[PDB]
């Protein structure tokens with residue numbers, strides 16, 4: 001969760017991606033916008049003789 | 050015969066000719082970098098393109 005610069009309109013609560021997954025949220029206690037980025041992942045290759 | 054338009058150009062950082070530069074500029078790649086490396090995608094800015 002990171003601080004974001006998305007200009008949320010006051011009636012808007014969530015942000016959505018192309019695949020309709022949530023990309024940004026509004027914190028309920030403090031009205032601020034948080035970007036959601038998935039944690040670091042990748043492939044692992046083994047190079048051996 | 051004049052082959053300066055197809056022989057490599059040493060002034061360019063990559064040794065490509067004039068015609069090869071035109072062929073590379075005319076084809077619009079979506080993303081030819083392949084060097085995103087997950088560090089570019091940490092920041093969610095609208096300049097990030099797909």
Ligand SMILES: *[C@@H]1O[C@H](CO)[C@@H](O[C@@H]2O[C@H](CO)[C@@H](O[C@@H]3O[C@H](CO[C@H]4O[C@H](CO)[C@@H](O)[C@H](O)[C@@H]4O)[C@@H](O)[C@H](O[C@H]4O[C@H](CO)[C@@H](O)[C@H](O)[C@@H]4O)[C@@H]3O)[C@H](O)[C@H]2NC(C)=O)[C@H](O)[C@H]1NC(C)=O
Pocket residue numbers: 051052053054
């Ligand atoms: C074999 O063929 C080559 C290429 O055809 C001839 O070499 C010269 O190449 C340049 C282009 O590389 C010809 O055009 C002139 O370019 C000058 C600027 O060049 C820069 O930009 C080009 C990309 O366009 C780069 O490749 C180059 O490295 C430079 O970074 C312009 O300033 C010139 O303008 C002059 O002429 C025009 C008329 O065409 C006038 O209107 C202008 O006012 C100005 O006077 C020009 O456009 C150039 O014509 C080629 N010839 C010469 C003599 O310089 C080789 O000469 C040729 N060799 C043989 C044996 O045939």
Ligand SMILES: *[C@@H]1O[C@H](CO)[C@@H](O)[C@H](O)[C@H]1NC(C)=O
Pocket residue numbers: 029030
């Ligand atoms: C709930 O949290 C907000 C944010 O600090 C605060 O302004 C508000 O007073 C709180 N309400 C209650 C009932 O504690």
